[PDB]
Write a protein that binds this ligand. Structure first.
Ligand SMILES: Nc1ncnc2c1ncn2[C@@H]1O[C@H](CSCC[C@H](N)C(=O)O)[C@@H](O)[C@H]1O
Ligand SMILES: Nc1ncnc2c1ncn2[C@@H]1O[C@H](CSCC[C@H](N)C(=O)O)[C@@H](O)[C@H]1O
Lengths: 250, 250
């Protein structure tokens, strides 16, 4: 085992999406990744298990009820033992990116608090949360999907998780990935770049790095401006741009 | 019914995460949102239902097998009838944001192609995809979570989906949301801003807009620079900054 993740959520079963399918399901099944959930609903005392409450100053929407949510978080922290980083999923937190992913991957223990409705009391955040994280500048119905997004992302780093089907993928080296092809040789009248059929290992390597650089330049120029390229990368980028400026475009 | 979403995925059951829980589950259960899936595996012809293949030029990783994936996509398009926008979930696509969400919400029909492994043949993308979308600058194990992220986001716009527990949330007006409080009056020694207890509707309104502006200014200044504030917003932003510059900080 390498990573334990505690989760606070009103919809615990949603997490089977990552715990029972694909490489993440595999990682969980083989104890490389542990995911335990605590539902605030189970900590309610009223006959109707109320997990929401009215915000002071009213307004539209409801907030998660404090007591049930706080008790679930404390219970989760009790099981986590010491060293767990408590994270609140929020569109107002640090926007996630590969760098943030690798940073989060360093933790051995995590606790992810998933909100619902309008969110949670701001005092809870100040007193129970270590960091706030967002998966992007958009709003979802709850923290569950974002929490799973975070888990899936950091799971790719746990040793033994990925197989023969990672270090070449987008943002890995700060660059987008190159295009890839497979059978058939001709698809809808389109062929595979001859070099990928030539079997020239070194040439194929350069073609891929060149494409990785060109695509980053064309789609995410700001990324290039941020990276410090090696001599070879600066040479392949020059060639990729030169090749592009040599052809007609749409 | 208002939106039909066709999905191509090797793990169809993952989608129960959104189709059977919360407001999205509710929206599906009540036919406001329709989600149909097609698994490429069901289109395989070999004894072992192979859905992956070796990339030309080799390298690490596998690609989704073309024929099974292409047949699933065509079948999905056949059911979609005409007018469906075909989307490929990819970390190299247009980065998602609220604006993009509202744009995507205009479509009545969507088809979301979820990749696995290293991805899919670049020719398939050129011949079957209308647009590529990313949920953020990080890499996940598959397109399923990103696809669900997209669905959940656009579902918030379908009429009848959200209830009394949306227009006040972050990015709605381009600004982050304000803090919110609920019972108890005192939490861990922390009290609720008196104004939220005063019951002064107009004052509470300004407090919320001011906080929304201050938080955006402090956390996402670039967003402010992009927005065109109204007179009242420019006045409340001035006050929020002035109030902040009047206190000690950590
Ligand atoms: N972009 C995203 N990243 C992480 N969590 C998100 C998210 N979008 C929504 N959430 C989660 O889903 C919940 C319901 S959305 C309510 C959001 C809140 N009023 C705001 O504007 O800050 C939030 O409490 C949060 O836990
Ligand atoms: N940020 C994200 N947004 C949308 N889809 C993503 C994603 N991260 C991963 N994927 C999805 O999961 C799949 C496995 S990840 C393989 C990614 C590919 N080599 C690249 O670098 O472009 C991708 O095919 C895609 O469908």
């Amino acid at each position: 085992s390498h990573m334990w993740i505690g989760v606070i959520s009103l919809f615990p079963e949603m997490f089977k999406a990552i715990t029972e399918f694909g490489v993440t399901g595999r990682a969980v099944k083989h104890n490389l990744l542990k995911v335990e959930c605590w539902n605030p609903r189970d900590f309610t005392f009223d006959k109707h298990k109320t997990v929401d409450d009215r915000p002071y100053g009213g307004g539209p929407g409801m907030l998660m009820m404090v007591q049930p949510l706080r008790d679930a978080i404390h219970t989760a922290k009790a099981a986590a033992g010491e060293g767990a980083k408590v994270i609140y999923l929020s569109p107002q937190g640090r926007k996630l990116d590969q760098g943030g992913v690798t940073e989060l991957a360093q933790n051995q223990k995590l606790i992810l608090v998933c909100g619902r409705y309008e969110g949670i009391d701001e005092r809870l955040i100040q007193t129970e949360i270590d960091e706030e994280w967002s998966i992007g500048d958009y709003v979802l119905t709850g923290g569950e999907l974002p929490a799973m997004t975070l888990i899936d992302a950091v799971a790719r780093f746990i040793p033994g998780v990925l197989g023969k089907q990672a270090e070449e993928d987008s943002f890995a080296d700060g660059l987008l990935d190159c295009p890839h092809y497979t059978r058939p040789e001709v698809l809808e009248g389109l062929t595979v770049p001859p070099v990928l059929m030539s079997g020239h290992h070194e040439e194929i390597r350069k073609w891929r790095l060149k494409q990785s650089l060109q695509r980053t330049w064309l789609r995410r120029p700001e990324l290039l401006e941020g990276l410090a390229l090696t001599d070879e990368q600066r040479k392949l980028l020059k060639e990729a741009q030169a090749e592009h400026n040599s052809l007609e475009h749409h």
